[PDB]
Enzyme design. Structure first.
Site, PDB file in Angstrom:
ATOM      1  N   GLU A  23       2.601   6.049  57.646  1.00  0.00           N
ATOM      2  CA  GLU A  23       3.491   4.895  57.690  1.00  0.00           C
ATOM      3  C   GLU A  23       4.052   4.485  56.331  1.00  0.00           C
ATOM      4  O   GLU A  23       3.311   4.333  55.356  1.00  0.00           O
ATOM      5  CB  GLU A  23       2.790   3.701  58.341  1.00  0.00           C
ATOM      6  CG  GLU A  23       2.276   4.031  59.718  1.00  0.00           C
ATOM      7  CD  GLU A  23       3.362   3.877  60.760  1.00  0.00           C
ATOM      8  OE1 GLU A  23       4.362   3.158  60.504  1.00  0.00           O
ATOM      9  OE2 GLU A  23       3.237   4.504  61.823  1.00  0.00           O
ATOM     10  N   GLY A  27       8.833   1.695  58.624  1.00  0.00           N
ATOM     11  CA  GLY A  27       8.932   2.840  59.507  1.00  0.00           C
ATOM     12  C   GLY A  27       7.955   3.922  59.118  1.00  0.00           C
ATOM     13  O   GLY A  27       7.338   3.889  58.055  1.00  0.00           O
ATOM     14  N   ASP A 139       2.854  -2.010  42.571  1.00  0.00           N
ATOM     15  CA  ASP A 139       2.014  -1.826  43.747  1.00  0.00           C
ATOM     16  C   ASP A 139       1.296  -0.511  43.665  1.00  0.00           C
ATOM     17  O   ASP A 139       1.208   0.219  44.658  1.00  0.00           O
ATOM     18  CB  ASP A 139       2.792  -1.894  45.067  1.00  0.00           C
ATOM     19  CG  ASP A 139       1.949  -2.402  46.233  1.00  0.00           C
ATOM     20  OD1 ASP A 139       0.776  -2.790  46.084  1.00  0.00           O
ATOM     21  OD2 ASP A 139       2.397  -2.203  47.367  1.00  0.00           O
TER      22      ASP A 139
HETATM   23  C1  LIG Z   1       5.366   7.169  49.895  1.00  0.00           C
HETATM   24  C2  LIG Z   1       6.428   7.641  50.903  1.00  0.00           C
HETATM   25  C3  LIG Z   1       6.606   9.151  50.969  1.00  0.00           C
HETATM   26  O1  LIG Z   1       5.362   9.744  51.454  1.00  0.00           O
HETATM   27  C4  LIG Z   1       5.335  11.075  51.576  1.00  0.00           C
HETATM   28  O2  LIG Z   1       6.213  11.806  51.187  1.00  0.00           O
HETATM   29  C5  LIG Z   1       4.042  11.585  52.103  1.00  0.00           C
HETATM   30  C6  LIG Z   1       3.878  12.985  52.052  1.00  0.00           C
HETATM   31  O3  LIG Z   1       4.867  13.772  51.577  1.00  0.00           O
HETATM   32  C7  LIG Z   1       2.719  13.591  52.485  1.00  0.00           C
HETATM   33  C8  LIG Z   1       1.693  12.788  52.945  1.00  0.00           C
HETATM   34  O4  LIG Z   1       0.524  13.365  53.355  1.00  0.00           O
HETATM   35  C9  LIG Z   1       1.823  11.412  53.019  1.00  0.00           C
HETATM   36  C10 LIG Z   1       2.981  10.805  52.593  1.00  0.00           C
HETATM   37  O5  LIG Z   1       3.120   9.457  52.653  1.00  0.00           O
HETATM   38  C11 LIG Z   1       2.238   8.670  53.463  1.00  0.00           C
HETATM   39  C12 LIG Z   1       2.676   7.241  53.268  1.00  0.00           C
HETATM   40  C13 LIG Z   1       2.304   6.755  51.864  1.00  0.00           C
HETATM   41  O6  LIG Z   1       0.866   6.701  51.843  1.00  0.00           O
HETATM   42  C14 LIG Z   1       2.887   5.368  51.583  1.00  0.00           C
HETATM   43  O7  LIG Z   1       2.497   4.525  52.649  1.00  0.00           O
HETATM   44  C15 LIG Z   1       4.401   5.391  51.384  1.00  0.00           C
HETATM   45  O8  LIG Z   1       5.137   5.137  52.312  1.00  0.00           O
HETATM   46  C16 LIG Z   1       4.955   5.745  50.033  1.00  0.00           C
END
Ligand SMILES: *[C@@H]1CCOC(=O)c2c(O)cc(O)cc2OCC[C@H](O)[C@H](O)C(=O)C1
EC number: 2.7.11.24
Length: 342
Positions: A23, A27, A139
């Site tokens: 998440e 979204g 953050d």
């Molecule tokens: C980061 C938003 C982009 O997240 C990612 O690209 C992402 C990738 O590529 C791999 C995995 O395993 C998790 C990812 O994001 C999870 C979400 C993340 O922890 C955070 O909540 C964000 O949205 C910021």
């Protein structure tokens, strides 16, 4: 139009074969196959246009990430949205596909000291670049640190970032704050708006402690309880550090507390590298003016196998950017994302 877990993920035909990951703020995040570059990618859905603060966070991140370019900051590869403002209801941000995030990793994996050292190096290397642009992330926490399959690290989520403003940092006691509770510096609850770079160094110190033990070091349950956790480990602030807090309500709150002894870092972390604990102490310093800065931290002996200022790049220039009605803000998001059309 593909759907994942009962929700529309309208990114074709370039991006196909979607899979859930997790998440974002407005979204979910999926992986997908990029039919042009022939690699799987990550895509975040953003539905911000009803709420003005949502539109703020979305625009802020896009503006920063389109200007930033750094190995330890995850970039924006593509933005998907409808061709007209009238038709645009969601925005999709396409980014490199990583393997995991540090929050998920720490729930089941013990880190070797070599992993801790390399992760911390990369966090600080990315942070050096962010702070060199005069930007605060605000953050930092394990879920915003992504790892690829070879443990290369990228910082995610600039939705709470701001330009540093140390001359306007002062505020009253118990001033409400938005960023994640467990990673908030003590001054947030006392007299700070979180407009100085020292706010991020505190969060990194919290992340380092959490890598050493797989548990958050200061897991407060509510605004003021966060401060009690911090003081429970650091002990009572010195007279000098109290005198730095001119606000009377904040100072008198600290003066009202019974004396608390410092808990030695090597009692809390008996397996940790002693150089790691020395750096930890300097990042989790109570007085933000005495707290170590990012370039000092990179030069600390714990990081000696990696430290190389010529390979720790900075931004070309300081970053410059709400009473803005969301209709102007949706219009601004539309314009900011035009470069990826068609
Ligand atoms: C980061 C938003 C982009 O997240 C990612 O690209 C992402 C990738 O590529 C791999 C995995 O395993 C998790 C990812 O994001 C999870 C979400 C993340 O922890 C955070 O909540 C964000 O949205 C910021």
């Amino acid at each position: 139009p593909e759907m994942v877990r009962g929700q529309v993920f309208d990114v074709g035909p370039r991006y196909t074969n979607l899979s859930y990951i997790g998440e974002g703020a407005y979204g979910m995040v999926c992986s997908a196959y990029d039919n042009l570059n022939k690699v799987r990618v990550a895509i975040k859905k953003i539905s911000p246009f009803e709420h003005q603060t949502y539109c703020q966070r979305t625009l802020r991140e896009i503006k920063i990430l389109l200007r930033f370019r750094h190995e330890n900051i995850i970039g924006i590869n593509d933005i998907i949205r409808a061709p007209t403002i009238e038709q645009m209801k969601d925005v999709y941000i396409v980014q490199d596909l990583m393997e995991t995030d540090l929050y998920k990793l720490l729930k089941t994996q013990h880190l070797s000291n070599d992993h801790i050292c390399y992760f911390l190096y990369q966090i600080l290397r990315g942070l050096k670049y962010i702070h060199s642009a005069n930007v605060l992330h605000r953050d930092l926490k394990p879920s915003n640190l992504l790892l690829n399959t070879t443990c290369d690290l990228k910082i995610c989520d600039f939705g709470l970032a701001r330009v540093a403003d140390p001359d306007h940092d002062h505020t009253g006691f118990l001033t409400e704050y938005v960023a994640t509770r467990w990673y908030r510096a003590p001054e947030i609850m006392l007299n700070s708006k979180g407009y100085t770079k020292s706010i991020d160094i505190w969060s990194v110190g919290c992340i380092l402690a959490e890598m050493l033990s797989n548990r958050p070091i200061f897991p407060g349950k509510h605004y003021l309880d966060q401060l009690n956790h911090i003081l429970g480990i650091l002990g009572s602030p010195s007279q000098e550090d109290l005198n730095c807090i001119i606000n009377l309500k904040a100072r008198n709150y600290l003066l009202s507390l019974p004396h608390k002894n410092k808990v030695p870092w090597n009692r809390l972390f008996p397996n940790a590298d002693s150089k790691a604990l020395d750096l930890l102490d300097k990042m989790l310093t109570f007085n933000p003016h005495k707290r170590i800065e990012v370039e000092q931290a990179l030069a600390h002996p714990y990081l000696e196998q990696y430290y190389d200022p010529s390979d720790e790049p900075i931004a070309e220039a300081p970053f410059k950017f709400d009473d803005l009605p969301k209709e102007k803000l949706k219009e601004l998001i539309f314009e900011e994302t035009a470069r990826f059309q068609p």
